[PDB]
Ligand binder design. Structure first.
Ligand SMILES: *[C@@](C)(CO)[C@](*)(O)[C@H](CC(C)C)NC(=O)[C@H](Cc1ccccc1)NC(=O)[C@H](CC(C)C)NC(=O)[C@H](CCc1ccccc1)NC(=O)CN1CCOCC1
Ligand SMILES: [Cl-]
Ligand SMILES: [Cl-]
Ligand SMILES: [Mg+2]
Ligand SMILES: [Mg+2]
Lengths: 232, 213, 204, 212, 195, 222, 234, 213, 195
């Protein structure tokens, strides 16, 4: 078993009133950049966003499970849109259970997943889970290349817990958008087009589609000639 | 199916996977290339120069292994400099022959897909392509690199002989634009080198321009 | 069939106030079988000391080789080789066999006779120099030795106190390694006197 | 590991080391390798630690159920066969166990059964099991007689483990002694090799290979 | 699987070596002498890969005999052992190494002391009071740890050796067809015919 | 081909006193050469004055702790709210681990608490269930660095009484909670210096008859 | 040729190179690893090829030191032969042709930087013999953490002080986020018309805190069997 | 490369390496395909029909394994016939879902790259592509098969939305012509199927025509 | 490996079986009886994979004893051998086959004739005047081709057997610690204590 059509990095971070999460709109087929209209951020209710990387067929399977979870929660539940609504912590633990069960049957869902959201009591939720069933939480979280390149940049803003209240939504979103640009420079299986989602405890869920990487530095390339000695 | 070319590369070495092409036209010949260099899925260099000078008006496009193509191009440049000191300016055919000799005789230890392009006054613009095997093929235009697969259809339909400079630049720009769009191993800026009687001209084109073609 | 862990053994070196210490175990085995409990791994050429862990045949071969090279050095230079120079000689000699290396983990220790400065150094099998103020470790219980040294070590220890620290580091590391132990030797090296002590340790 | 047990005039001597390894890493020096199944039955452990420990405590449960059902203590033969039939069901699955079921009953007398994870079950007077079994055999065989005293037999068992503890890299820690009579098993103490080696070297005058 | 033992006592060195030569499922010979005299007071026993053992032993023997003629002088056991070790140390990094393990028992006439050296095919030399190669050591070392004393006589050493052979005959899987025993002392080398 | 195991690094440490017991563990979580989290706890209060940690492959570690916590819950339901003794918990964990003998939990488990005489207890487990009570145990990535230090400082190994010719050993004695925490903090700072997978933060859980207390300390973040 | 040694030291690292107004600066961390174990907590990864050409090295530690010294030796002889100060392209050409000849078996990954009569230069060399030109470059296990910082903050026309800040910030990103890198930050500045200044331990943000206890043993704690005076004299 | 698509096949099985595409347009949708089937380098069938009916106005293009795609298409046709008996005419989305379910749940044992195309009266022309993984992707047009690699550049540059019937037929003809020219696994005749409100129309085009485009 | 032999003579069947049980480089036991009595006039010797041998032998023994009780009648050696063969023939195509080779020596009371059957782990049955399993056959078959006669007595058969054991002790690589000999005849089964 292996992933065929794949999605690359998913990045995310916490800020004073909520969480931000982002992911590009590419479905790679090996080295071929085959599909360009792939949404890899999937909202669940008006308080959670699940970002998924890895195998896209397995992503679409998870989509259907989450869709079905909202339906099932509504059954015989008069408080489905109030006290007994789906929380980010519920949605995550469900997925984490599935991922670990599948790895334990030697038949894993190939993915790396980040569940971002805001709880009912206003607390920020951000936690990671992957094909192995491994889970962890941190002020910043990222998958694939994001882990190597985005996290370093995002940790300069929020290095520890105490930096979260000091970080505004403007500063946080700027860091995310910057990180997406760096990934476009340096990740061979990434695209310019991406989606971004903000879940705030006050202003709620804001889903931004069709964003582009901009303000790129390419001008210095013209001065670079040859690979050593060549002058022309 | 061309994963096999990448398969030939030594473990962990830098890969040139590329979108390179050379096109003859009325006034001479134009070489074109992307600027991406990869180590797996990490882009080691996003502003590479794959168009390299082996003589005043004989250049080449490099693809395959970065190390192998550089080592070869350096040796060829040495041979042609020594040729010039004894026998005067070498023909583009002569340059392609020296490339072939190195690529063919070391075909097992090398991964180098090279396009040779030059301008004589007698022979005008000429293009020779040298694939992995070490064979030589003289053509009106040539395409190569991992990204070239995606533009065989486009280039065959759109290429005409005796094009103008502006038409040839548009042909190369549109072609490499598509190759870059579809090939993950290709990207960055589009470098070009114009070879005519007038001299040598370097051109560059940035993403903001060519992406929205 | 891993050359570095057929025979087993350990070496450790430390610095102190105007002194250095170098210590080693005495075991030579063939995997599980203990064969000899008298196999010393520390040698000396003039005032420069060399400890060597790893494949025993190479330990012996390198000792004979550096005895050879330091003797010719002395005849031509008309002086004893210094630790800094000897360290470079070991590095050169190991890298000369880059693609057919001696399977060893050598450790240099000594005091420079001109400047009086305590000196220690370690190498990998192909001659990469590892210089250190504090301590150098080598052998099948290197992880254990790293742990003991990092916690027990403090700078500027007197020769008598330094002896206790290095001895406790070696003993407790050796007892957590199956292929190391069976006795131990500690060298305490001052500017112009050198004491050699055999430690009592558990013989299993 | 190194474990042994031998039969003699005055019953059965059982002796084991206490080391546990994970490759060349010495993980523990204080492992109990003798399991006390009941006042008349002992079991030794060698090989995979978990396999031995788990299945021999399980064996003790099966022996208890026997005496509840049959109103009588289980025979050494029957106890050993429960274990040998169990591991045989797991043959090929990768269990690693080298055990000895030692004990006394009226009908059998003092009896020792070697039982290993590839299904072998053997009755016998002398057995040494483990990575250092050969070292123990060398000392034990060359000094063994049926007419040994309880004092001499206890010492020979202790000395045979010590011999193996010394030479075998994967044996050591301390020696646990047991003596099995018609009245049941009797524990004869934990003996650390740290002190025991030097005590034995001085008093016996042996171990001349070592720097005294 | 080939048994070679060695015991150094007060005034002599005793080497015991198995007589069996086995190929496949057949014992081709049961009276083989796995040793060569290197010099009047130096004896080397050997065991390992077929062919290599005798080829190596005789090659060393020739070299030591050449030295003796040239200098009209016998090399010390320490000197011979160092020469042998170096040859094996060269060998291990050759195109095809000698897969031979040896024991060198000798009597140094200048020191008036017996000496026993154990060298494996890698070139790993150790001086010992008692030594063994192959699976034999797994039994004999612990046995000798117990029974050996440094001040023993040659007769006491032979009884100590009998104790080893008995144990090996009891617990070894293969029939090695007994041993040839040889004694090295101040009066040279001699063979014990009845063992 | 799919590999179901992974290494999440980290290291843990249990020490037992006279009337108390500590179970410490760093808060760093890693994969390969990357840091996943600087604060991800892996030492848990499981109820009945039992603290537990299962270091190694975090997914298997979490699954095991989760299952033991649940085992404690069902022990109360089935046996009239009886307190689960540390020795009983240890045996129960053996069966959890050995249950997956042929597809193991890749973890080194340590539990700590008080025995039925009120005295400090530490139990340690291998991946397939073999267990042993000890005064002292380090587990995880830096276990090989810390463990011999503990042999020397807790159990006074290789230490003899000065002037007694190496005849009389240094006498064994229980350590105070203050002295034990000193050894833990020094063990982890040393392990942080020399092991790349160890750092960020240290979380100690102390267990006395009064309950379970926590203490946190910063560690180097490189 | 031997297909790798696992025992051979191969340190994790973060080395970078940044070009500025009147020259070039390189920097590095100071951790040397053995597997997961930190062997040296303050090694020097910045090497001297010639007075004004310096070389940062990652990969197989023995190969980077050995190859930098060999080329440095030949560069010195070349400089004496030609009566000229050595050029960076000469070191570049000699390094790549050596590394290429061995087909990657010499695992040296280098950032070369320096000044010479031609000007200021910055190159990178990979083990297989390929070379790259750039204004900013990073290698080592923490290259991605460093390059993320370089891509975020680098601009054209940097000053000396800005380049040192950018370089050390890139190394810090490796120190904190990459497990292969750590400890201190070394820097070497090579400006045109001036001597190159080597700033050993330019930053030391990872100082070991005071230990809770002293582990100085009472004298006589260790049991001894034999003492003897060793003869070092003739 | 294309190899790991063909490296999936079982030893010796018939290969459906292909040049298949489906294109939506003003009046509905058009499916297109070549006719070549190979066993290694031998052409087992030069006149194959890769365009297959699963319902009146829901068709699919097959690529990958001949056996696997046939077995799947037969099952889908069975499901949609049973669907029609109970719930009436199924949507094109419904058909794609049934294809996905079979491809995804049996992703390890199958090699089937299927394009689904259909015509509703409400939804007009629709195209869903289902690659090897078993994922679903709704698109304006889709290309697939070994020969599609060579026409990514051409198709992206030349495709427009709301084309006429004659324009779409020319677009498919020119595209597959190039795919066939460059891909050895593709060839023979170019079959097409037109899906509109008018009904179902079959078209065929022979080498003598399309080769010299 | 293990040695199991069988010789059918005029009025009896003689089975010889090695006493050694070896694991690794250690002979764990030197008095092992590699046989089980299936019925008063039927004896089965066995050799092969550790554990499997005894588990198989006892399983057969139980089944034959169950038949004897049920029918109050002893099964003929031919009938027992056919039952054993079928069990091995089933076994070889199981998930984990019994790797056991056996010799079945019996005295048929109805025919008043001795019978010897050789069955391998595949379920390959043959009735023979003399038989052997493992490497033993490579020596004993040619020896018996020469010395065996069909009309020999039990005493002549024992001398013929001694000749086999001597040859094996001379030319076999492994020490198999002698043999336990048992005789099957009209009066049942008995063991020769001094061999
Ligand atoms: C002598 C000492 C050696 O043979 C004895 O035989 C003892 C027997 C006593 C303990 C009963 N044997 C061992 O100590 C035994 C050796 C061994 C190891 C593995 C397989 C067979 C034999 N040691 C163990 O079993 C250790 C005991 C631990 C240290 C308490 N356990 C392990 O090595 C475990 C589990 C092994 C295992 C078996 C089957 C399936 C899965 C796992 N492995 C680890 O702990 C892995 N790892 C090693 C490095 O440290 C981190 C954990
Ligand atoms: Cl390049
Ligand atoms: Cl078909
Ligand atoms: Mg031992
Ligand atoms: Mg064709």
């Amino acid at each position: 078993q292996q992933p065929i059509v794949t999605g690359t990095s998913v990045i995310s971070m916490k800020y004073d009133n909520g969480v931000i999460i982002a992911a590009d709109n590419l479905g790679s087929y090996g080295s071929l950049l085959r599909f360009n209209g792939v949404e890899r951020l999937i909202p669940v209710g008006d308080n959670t966003v699940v970002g998924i990387s890895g195998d896209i067929s397995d992503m679409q399977h998870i989509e259907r499970l989450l869709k079905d979870l909202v339906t099932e929660n509504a059954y015989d539940n008069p408080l489905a849109d109030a006290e007994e609504a789906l929380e980010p912590s519920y949605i995550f633990e469900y997925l984490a259970t599935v991922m670990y069960q599948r790895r334990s049957k030697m038949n894993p869902l190939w993915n790396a997943i980040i569940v971002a959201g805001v709880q009912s009591n206003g607390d920020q939720f951000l936690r990671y889970v992957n094909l192995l069933g491994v889970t962890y939480s941190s002020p910043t979280l990222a998958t694939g290349f994001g882990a190597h390149m985005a996290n370093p940049l995002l940790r300069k803003v929020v290095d520890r817990e105490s930096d979260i209240p000091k970080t505004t939504v403007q500063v946080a979103e700027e860091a995310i958008v910057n990180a997406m640009r760096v990934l476009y420079y340096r990740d061979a299986r990434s695209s310019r087009n991406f989606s971004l989602a903000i879940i705030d405890k006050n202003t709620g869920l804001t889903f931004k589609k069709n964003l582009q990487v901009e303000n790129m530095k390419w001008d210095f390339a013209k001065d670079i000639k040859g690979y050593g000695t060549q002058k022309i | 199916g061309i994963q096999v070319d990448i398969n030939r590369l030594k473990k962990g070495e830098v890969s040139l996977g590329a979108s390179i092409m050379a096109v003859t036209f009325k006034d001479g010949v134009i070489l074109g290339a992307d600027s991406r260099t990869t180590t797996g899925a990490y882009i080691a260099n996003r502003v590479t120069d794959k168009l390299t000078r082996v003589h005043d008006k004989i250049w080449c496009c490099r693809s395959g292994s970065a190390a192998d193509t550089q080592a070869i191009a350096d040796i060829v440049q040495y041979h042609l400099e020594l040729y010039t000191s004894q026998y005067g300016t070498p023909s583009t055919e002569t340059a392609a022959s020296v490339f072939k000799e190195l690529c063919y005789e070391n075909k097992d230890n090398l991964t180098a897909g090279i396009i040779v392009a030059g301008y004589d006054d007698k022979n005008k613009g000429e293009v020779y392509t040298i694939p992995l095997g070490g064979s030589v093929h003289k053509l009106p235009y040539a395409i190569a690199g991992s990204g070239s697969t995606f533009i065989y259809g486009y280039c065959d339909k759109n290429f005409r002989e005796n094009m103008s400079k502006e038409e040839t630049v548009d042909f190369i720009k549109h072609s490499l634009s598509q190759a870059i769009k579809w090939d993950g191993s290709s990207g960055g800026v589009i470098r070009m080198v114009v070879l005519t009687a007038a001299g040598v001209e370097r051109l560059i084109f940035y993403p903001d321009e060519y992406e929205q073609l | 069939s891993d050359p570095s862990s057929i025979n087993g053994g350990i070496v450790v070196a430390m610095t102190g106030k105007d002194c250095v210490a170098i210590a080693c175990d005495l075991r030579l085995g063939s995997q599980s079988l203990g064969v000899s409990n008298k196999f010393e791994k520390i040698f000396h050429y003039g005032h420069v000391f060399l400890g060597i862990t790893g494949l025993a045949t190479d330990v012996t071969t390198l000792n004979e080789m550096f005895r050879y090279k330091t003797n010719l050095y002395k005849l031509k230079e008309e002086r004893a080789i210094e630790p800094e120079t000897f360290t470079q000689l070991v590095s050169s000699s190991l890298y000369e066999r880059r693609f057919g290396p001696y399977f060893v983990g050598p450790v240099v220790a000594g005091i420079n006779s001109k400047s009086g400065k305590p000196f220690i150094a370690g190498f990998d099998l192909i001659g990469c120099i590892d210089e250190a103020k504090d301590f150098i470790v080598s052998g099948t219980a290197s992880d254990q030795l790293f742990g003991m040294c990092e916690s027990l070590y403090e700078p500027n220890l007197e020769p008598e106190d330094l002896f206790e620290t290095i001895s406790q580091a070696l003993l407790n590391a050796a007892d957590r390694d199956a292929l190391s132990g069976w006795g131990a030797v500690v060298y305490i090296i001052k500017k112009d006197e050198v004491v050699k002590r055999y430690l009592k340790m558990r013989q299993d | 590991t190194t474990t042994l047990a031998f039969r003699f005039q005055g019953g059965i001597i059982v002796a084991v080391d206490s080391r546990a390894t994970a490759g060349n890493w010495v993980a523990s020096q204080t492992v109990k390798k003798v399991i006390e199944i009941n006042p008349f039955l002992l079991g030794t452990m060698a090989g995979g630690a978990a396999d031995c420990q788990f299945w021999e405590t399980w064996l003790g449960s099966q022996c208890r159920l026997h005496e509840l059902r049959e109103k009588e203590r289980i025979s050494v033969a029957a106890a050993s066969k429960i274990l040998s039939n169990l591991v045989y069901q797991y043959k090929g699955a990768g269990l690693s166990m080298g055990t000895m079921i030692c004990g006394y009953t009226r009908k059998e007398g003092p009896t020792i059964y070697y039982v290993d994870s590839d299904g072998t079950r053997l009755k016998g007077d002398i057995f040494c099991v483990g990575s250092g079994q050969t070292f123990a055999y060398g000392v034990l065989d060359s000094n063994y007689k049926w007419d040994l005293s309880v004092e001499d037999a206890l010492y020979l068992g202790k000395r045979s483990i010590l011999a193996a503890a010394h030479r075998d890299a994967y044996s050591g820690g301390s020696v646990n002694l047991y003596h099995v009579t018609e009245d049941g098993w009797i524990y004869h103490g934990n003996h650390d090799v740290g002190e025991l080696f030097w005590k034995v070297k001085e008093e016996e005058g042996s171990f001349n290979n070592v720097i005294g | 699987m080939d048994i070679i033992l060695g015991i150094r006592v007060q005034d002599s060195v005793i080497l015991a070596s198995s007589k069996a030569v086995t190929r496949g499922i057949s014992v081709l010979k049961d009276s083989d002498d796995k040793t060569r005299q290197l010099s009047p007071h130096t004896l080397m026993s050997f065991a390992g890969e077929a062919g290599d053992t005798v080829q190596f032993a005789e090659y060393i023997q020739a070299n030591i005999q050449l030295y003796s003629i040239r200098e009209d002088y016998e090399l010390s056991p320490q000197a011979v052992s160092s020469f042998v070790r170096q040859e094996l140390a060269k060998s291990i990094r050759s195109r095809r190494p000698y897969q031979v393990n040896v024991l060198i028992g000798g009597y140094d006439k200048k020191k008036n002391k017996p000496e026993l050296y154990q060298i494996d095919y890698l070139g790993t030399k150790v001086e010992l009071p008692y030594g063994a190669h192959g699976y034999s050591g797994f039994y004999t070392f612990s046995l000798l740890d117990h029974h050996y004393r440094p001040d023993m006589t040659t007769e006491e050493g032979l009884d100590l050796l009998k104790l080893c052979v008995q144990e090996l005959e009891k617990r070894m899987p293969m029939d090695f067809k007994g041993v040839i025993v040889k004694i090295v002392d101040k009066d040279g080398i001699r063979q014990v015919d009845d063992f | 081909q799919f590999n179901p195991y992974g290494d999440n690094g980290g290291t843990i440490l249990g020490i037992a006193g006279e009337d108390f017991a500590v179970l410490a563990g760093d808060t760093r979580n890693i994969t390969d050469y990357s840091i996943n989290s600087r604060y991800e706890p892996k030492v848990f209060d499981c109820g009945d004055n039992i603290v537990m940690s299962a270091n190694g492959f975090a997914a298997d570690g979490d699954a095991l702790v989760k299952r033991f916590k649940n085992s404690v819950k069902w022990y109360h339901f089935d046996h009239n709210d009886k307190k689960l003794s540390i020795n009983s918990a240890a045996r129960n964990i053996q069966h959890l681990l050995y249950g997956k003998r042929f597809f193991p939990y890749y973890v080194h488990t340590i539990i700590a608490g008080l025995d039925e005489d009120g005295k400090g207890a530490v139990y340690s487990f291998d991946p397939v269930g073999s267990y042993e009570r000890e005064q002292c145990r380090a587990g995880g990535a830096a276990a090989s660095l810390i463990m011999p230090f503990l042999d020397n400082q807790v159990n006074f190994k290789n230490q003899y009484e000065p002037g007694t010719n190496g005849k009389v050993k240094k006498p064994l004695k229980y350590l105070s909670v203050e002295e034990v925490i000193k050894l833990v903090r020094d063990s982890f700072t040393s392990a942080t210096e020399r092991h790349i997978q160890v750092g960020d933060g240290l979380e100690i859980l102390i267990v006395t008859k009064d309950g379970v207390r926590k203490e946190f300390y910063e560690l180097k973040r490189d | 040729n031997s297909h790798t040694q696992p025992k051979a030291t191969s340190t994790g690292a973060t080395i970078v190179g940044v070009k500025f107004n009147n020259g070039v600066v390189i920097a590095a961390d100071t951790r040397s690893t053995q597997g997961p174990i930190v062997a040296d907590k303050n090694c020097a990864k910045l090497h001297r090829i010639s007075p004004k050409i310096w070389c940062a090295g990652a990969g197989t530690a023995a190969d980077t030191e050995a190859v930098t010294q060999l080329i440095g030796s030949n560069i010195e002889l070349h400089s004496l032969y030609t009566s000229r100060e050595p050029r960076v392209v000469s070191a570049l050409q000699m390094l790549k042709q050596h590394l290429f000849k061995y087909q990657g078996h010499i695992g040296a990954y280098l950032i070369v930087a320096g000044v010479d009569p031609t000007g200021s230069h910055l190159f990178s060399i990979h083990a297989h013999g390929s070379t790259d030109v750039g204004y900013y470059l990073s290698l080592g296990s923490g290259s991605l953490a460093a390059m993320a910082v370089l891509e975020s903050h680098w601009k054209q026309d940097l000053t000396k002080e800005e380049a040192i800040k950018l370089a050390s910030d890139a190394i810090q990103a490796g120190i904190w986020n990459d497990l292969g890198s750590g400890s201190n930050v070394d820097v070497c500045v090579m400006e045109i018309g001036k001597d190159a200044e080597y700033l050993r331990n330019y930053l030391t943000p990872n100082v070991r805190e005071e230990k809770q206890k002293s582990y100085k043993f009472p004298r006589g704690t260790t049991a001894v069997l034999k003492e003897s005076i060793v003869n070092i004299c003739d």
